Nucleic acid binder design. Structure first.
Lengths: 190, 179, 73, 232
RNA sequence: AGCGAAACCACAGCCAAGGGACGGGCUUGGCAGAAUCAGCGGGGGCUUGUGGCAGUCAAGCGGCGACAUUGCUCAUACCGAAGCAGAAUUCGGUAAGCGUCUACUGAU
RNA sequence: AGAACUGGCGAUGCGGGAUGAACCGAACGUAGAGUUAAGGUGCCGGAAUACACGCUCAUCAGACCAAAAGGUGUUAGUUCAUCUAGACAGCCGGACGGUGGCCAUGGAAGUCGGAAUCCGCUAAGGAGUGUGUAACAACUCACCGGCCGAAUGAACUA
C-alpha cells in the first residue's frame, strides 16, 4: 500500500541521554556511552518530550518499512546496554582433555588463549573486541563470563569463542569438547 | 533380499544385451534416442519396485556391522541366570567393559563381551541378554550351545531381588539336558 | 563398541551442552533457504528441485484430504 | 508472499466457533429464571479434577457454562440489557476466570461450603512460597530430597536440558544422573514466584500451596440484593 | 667480381561476432610502423536423467487430464548429512583444480 | 507433405529496420522552398536527460519455445472464515473420569505394534499431534480460559 508515514516509539529511561543528528546515534548513561551509525538506513528521528524518541519513514515501501523496526531494536539494545548491561556466560566443558583458557597481552591486545583443546598442539587465540571485558567465574566449574555494553561486541566475541573450538571432522555425538553460551543474562539484573 | 538383488542384476544384464543389439543397428537419432530411454526405462522400473527389500538391507547393514565381535573358537566365559540378578554388573567387574546396571528385569537385550587375560592367555566373558519363547532369549540359547565355554549360573540368597531360589532351581532343570 | 556404543552416549552424556539450539536454528533457517534454493540451483538442479518440490506439496495436500474424511466420519 | 507459514497438526478436535458462544449466551439467561440464588466466583486459578470434585459434590448447584465477557453481556452490562432487575450492577463486579455459581441452596450453605473447603495446589506464578528448599549439593533426584534420598529415584537424563536451560540452574550430566556443585536455593519465603521459580517447584511436584475458590458477590432473582460476603 | 631468367600477377590479402545460402571487400568493436630482415619450418529461445502396451484414481481444465498408480519387460583439496566409537568409506555441493599470405621468433 | 485460390518478389531505385531475399512506408526527369509515411529524440545520430500514472534488483536482468510448475520475491485484485460476545500473534493457566480402554508380551500406561476409537462432566480436551523412558514420569498441540488491543487468516487471478 506504500504507507505514507510509518512511526515507531522508543522509550528513554531517565537514567540515559541520547543525542541525535545526521544518523550517528550516541547514547550516554551510568554505565558509559555507546555510538552507532545509521546513515545507511535513511530514517528520521524526532525528540517528543525527552522520554520518547520517534523514528518515522515517509513513503516507505515494504522493504523499507521492515528496516524501520530494526532502528528501534538497535537503539533499544544500546539503551538497555548502558542501563542494564549484557552478560554472556559460557562453559568450556570437556570429556578427557582439560580445556585451558587464559589471557595474554601480546602487543597489548589481551588475546584470549585456548590450549589443550582435544589434545591439539595448536594454540587458539581469540581477539577481544573493544568494550567487552572477560572475567572468569569463581567457584563455578569451567565457566567463563563475558560482560560489556555493546551487544554486537559481547555477542560476537562469544560466537568467535564457540566457533573456533569446532571439532575437525569428527563424530559430533561422541565428541563434546567445546565452548557454549550457557546463558545470556544481564549484568545488573533485577 | 540377496536373491532379489541378484535377480535385478541379471535383469539389468538382459536390458543391456537386448537394447544394445537393437541400438547398434539403428538408423535414426530418434530411434536410438527413444530406444536409449527404453533401455534405461526398465532399469528404473526394476530398481523402483525393489524399494521394499532395499530398505530392509540398509537396516540390517547399519545393525549387523554394529554386532559385537564374539569369537566362538577362542575361550569364552558365558554368563547366565535369572534376568539381571547381579550378572550384568559382574561383567564390568571382571574387566574394562560397560553394561547398564539399572536393575530392571531385562536390563540387556543383546550380547556383550569383556576381554581379560589369565596365565598370559586371552579370555572373553560373555553376558546373556536374559532367560525367563521370546526371540530375544533365543539369542542366548544358541550362544550357550555353540560357544566353547564353561557357563556361570547366577542366583541370589540374601540381598538382590529377594527372589525365591525355588523358581531358579526349577528353571535350571529346564536347561540341564542342553548345556 | 558392543552394539549401543552411541545410543548409550545420547544418554549418560547428552548430545552436547547446547545441541537443540543448533538443530532448532537450522530448522527455522530451512524455510528461508528453501526460497533461496528455488531461485538458485540452475540447470538440472532446478528441474529436479521443482519436480521434487511439486510432488511434496501434492502429497502433503492428499494427506490433509484423507484426514478430513476420517475426522468427519 | 513473504508471510509466516501457518503450521497445524491434524487432530480430531476442531474449533467451536461463535455458535458455541450463542448457546453459552442463552444458558446464563435461562439459569436466572430456573434457579433462585446467583453467585459469582473469582477462582483465578483452577485444577480440572478439583473442579469436577466441586462440581460433582452437588447436583442442584450448577457452575454456569460461559465465558467471562460473554457472561457480562448475557447478564447485561446496563439497566437496558439486564435480564433481571439489579443484575447489571452485579455483572460488572467480576472479572478474570469464568467463575460463577447458580444454585438453589441457601446462602448459609454456600458460605459454609466454600469457607470450609480447601485443597493443596502447586506454587503458581505471582505467589510467594510458604516454605524454602535447597537442592542437594550433589546428584539430584526426582523429588529433590524432600522425601528420603535413599527412597528417591535419580532424575532422568532426558529432563537435564530443561533444568540447565529453562530453569537456568548450572546442572550437568554425570553418568546419566544430573549433578550440581552447590545447594541451589530454588526459592524462599517472601519472594514473588517467577515462572522459572514456579516451574522448578512444579517439576519437583512440591504442592506447597493451598487452593480455595474465593467468592465476593451474592444475588437473588427476587430479593435482587447486591450484598457481597466476600471471603479471601 | 661480371653476366642475368622463368612460373605467376583484377585488386588487397588482421582479428570476435552479425553478414540469411559467399566470405576477401558489407556492418558492430578492437587493430596497424614509416622502413627493413634471419631462423623453428606452422601451414602451402536444437541438446542430457527417469520405456512400450494396457487399467484404476484424480489437482485441476471444462467431456480432457500432471506426479503418484496396477499387470511383464571418481585418486586431490574445503564444506553439509550418514550407528561416521577409531581407521577406512559412501552421498551432496564448490575449485573443474588434478590423473589413471600469415602465427611465432632472432635482428636492424 | 500435398491439390488449388489470392497477394509481395521475379524487371526495382528511396528512408527505417545497427547489415541483411520475402520486414514497415513509399512506385524515381534536373532543381529551390515547406509538411510528412515508417523509425526515432543520452553520445556515435539530425530530434525533448519532455510531462503524467504505475511497474523491477536480476551473481551475464530488461531492451533478442522445452516454461506445465517452484520461489518466506514484489505489486493490485477475486471467493470464503473470524471480529469490540475482544480478529492475529506473544506469554501464563486448564489440558480431566472410566482408563494402565481391548489383544499380541518381560513392557506399549495416548505416543515400537493390530480393530474400535466408546463415554461423563466440563470452559475445552484426540483411548491422544509430537518431543521424551527399558516401561513410568515430564514437556508440547488441538481444544478452551486469563493479560494484551482491530483488523486478521485460508485458497486463487493477474
Amino acid at each position: 500500500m506504500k504507507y505514507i508515514q510509518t512511526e515507531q516509539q522508543i522509550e528513554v529511561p531517565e537514567g540515559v541521554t541520547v543525542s541525535i543528528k545526521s544518523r550517528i546515534v550516541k547514547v550516554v548513561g551510568p554505565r558509559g556511552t555507546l555510538t552507532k551509525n545509521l546513515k545507511h538506513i535513511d530514517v528520521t528521528f524526532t525528540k517528543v518530550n525527552n522520554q520518547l524518541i520517534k523514528v518515522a519513514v515517509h513513503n516507505g515501501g515494504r522493504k523499507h518499512v521492515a528496516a524501520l523496526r530494526t532502528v528501534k531494536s538497535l537503539v533499544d539494545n544500546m539503551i538497555t546496554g548502558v542501563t542494564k548491561g549484557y552478560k554472556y556466560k559460557m562453559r568450556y566443558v570437556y570429556a578427557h582433555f582439560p580445556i585451558n583458557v587464559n589471557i595474554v597481552e601480546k602487543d597489548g591486545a589481551k588475546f584470549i588463549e585456548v590450549r589443550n583443546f582435544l589434545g591439539d598442539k595448536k594454540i587458539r587465540n581469540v581477539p577481544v573486541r573493544d568494550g567487552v571485558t572477560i572475567e572468569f567465574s569463581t567457584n563455578v566449574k569451567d565457566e567463563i563470563v563475558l560482560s560489556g555494553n555493546s551487544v554486537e561486541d559481547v555477542s560476537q566475541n562469544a560466537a568467535d569463542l564457540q566457533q573456533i573450538c569446532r571439532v575437525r571432522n569428527k563424530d559430533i555425538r561422541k565428541f563434546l569438547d567445546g565452548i557454549y553460551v550457557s546463558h545470556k543474562g544481564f549484568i545488573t539484573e533485577d | 533380499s540377496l536373491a532379489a538383488i541378484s535377480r535385478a542384476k541379471s535383469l539389468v544384464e538382459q536390458v543391456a544385451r537386448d537394447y544394445v543389439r537393437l541400438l547398434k543397428f539403428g538408423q535414426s537419432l530418434f530411434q536410438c534416442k527413444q530406444l536409449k530411454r527404453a533401455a534405461l526405462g526398465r532399469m528404473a522400473t526394476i530398481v523402483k519396485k525393489l524399494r521394499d527389500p532395499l530398505a530392509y538391507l540398509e537396516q540390517v547393514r547399519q545393525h549387523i556391522g554394529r554386532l559385537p565381535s564374539i569369537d566362538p573358537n577362542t575361550r569364552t566365559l558365558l554368563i547366565c541366570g535369572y534376568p539381571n540378578v547381579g550378572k550384568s554388573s559382574f561383567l564390568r567387574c571382571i574387566t574394562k567393559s560397560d553394561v547398564d546396571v539399572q536393575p530392571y528385569a531385562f536390563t540387556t537385550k543383546s550380547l556383550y563381551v569383556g576381554h581379560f587375560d589369565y596365565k598370559y592367555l586371552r579370555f572373553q566373558a560373555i553376558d546373556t541378554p536374559g532367560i525367563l519363547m521370546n526371540n530375544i532369549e533365543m539369542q542366548s540359547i544358541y550362544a550357550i550351545a555353540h560357544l566353547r565355554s564353561c557357563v556361570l549360573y547366577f542366583m541370589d540368597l540374601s540381598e538382590q531381588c529377594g527372589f525365591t531360589i525355588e523358581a531358579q532351581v526349577k528353571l535350571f532343570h529346564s536347561i540341564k539336558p542342553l548345556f | 563398541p558392543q552394539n549401543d556404543y552411541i545410543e548409550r552416549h545420547i544418554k549418560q552424556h547428552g548430545k552436547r551442552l547446547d545441541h537443540e539450539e543448533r538443530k532448532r536454528k537450522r530448522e527455522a533457517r530451512e524455510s528461508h533457504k528453501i526460497s533461496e534454493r528455488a531461485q538458485k540451483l540452475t540447470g538440472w538442479k532446478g528441474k529436479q528441485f521443482a519436480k521434487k518440490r511439486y510432488a511434496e506439496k501434492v502429497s502433503m495436500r492428499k494427506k490433509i484430504k484423507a484426514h478430513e474424511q476420517s475426522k468427519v466420519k | 508472499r513473504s508471510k509466516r507459514s501457518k503450521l497445524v497438526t491434524l487432530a480430531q478436535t476442531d474449533k467451536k466457533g461463535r455458535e458455541n458462544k450463542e448457546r453459552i449466551f442463552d444458558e446464563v439467561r435461562e439459569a436466572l429464571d430456573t434457579y433462585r440464588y446467583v453467585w459469582v466466583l473469582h477462582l483465578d486459578d483452577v485444577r480440572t479434577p478439583v473442579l469436577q470434585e466441586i462440581r460433582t459434590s452437588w447436583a442442584g448447584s450448577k457452575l454456569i457454562m460461559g465465558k467471562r465477557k460473554v457472561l457480562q453481556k448475557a447478564l447485561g452490562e446496563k439497566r437496558e440489557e439486564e435480564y433481571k432487575e439489579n443484575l447489571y450492577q452485579l455483572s460488572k463486579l467480576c472479572s478474570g476466570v469464568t467463575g460463577l455459581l447458580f444454585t438453589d441452596e441457601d446462602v448459609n450453605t454456600v458460605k459454609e461450603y466454600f469457607k470450609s473447603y480447601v485443597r493443596s495446589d502447586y506454587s503458581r506464578p505471582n505467589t510467594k512460597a510458604p516454605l524454602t528448599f535447597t537442592i542437594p549439593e550433589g546428584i539430584v533426584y526426582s523429588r529433590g530430597g524432600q522425601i528420603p534420598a535413599e527412597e528417591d529415584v535419580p532424575m532422568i537424563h532426558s529432563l537435564e536440558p530443561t533444568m540447565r536451560n529453562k530453569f537456568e540452574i548450572p546442572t550437568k550430566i554425570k553418568a546419566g544422573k544430573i549433578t550440581i556443585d552447590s545447594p541451589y536455593l530454588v526459592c524462599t519465603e517472601g519472594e514473588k514466584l517467577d515462572v522459572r521459580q514456579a516451574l522448578i517447584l512444579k517439576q519437583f511436584g512440591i504442592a506447597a500451596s493451598e487452593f480455595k475458590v474465593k467468592v465476593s458477590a451474592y444475588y437473588d432473582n427476587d430479593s435482587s440484593t447486591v450484598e457481597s460476603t466476600n471471603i479471601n
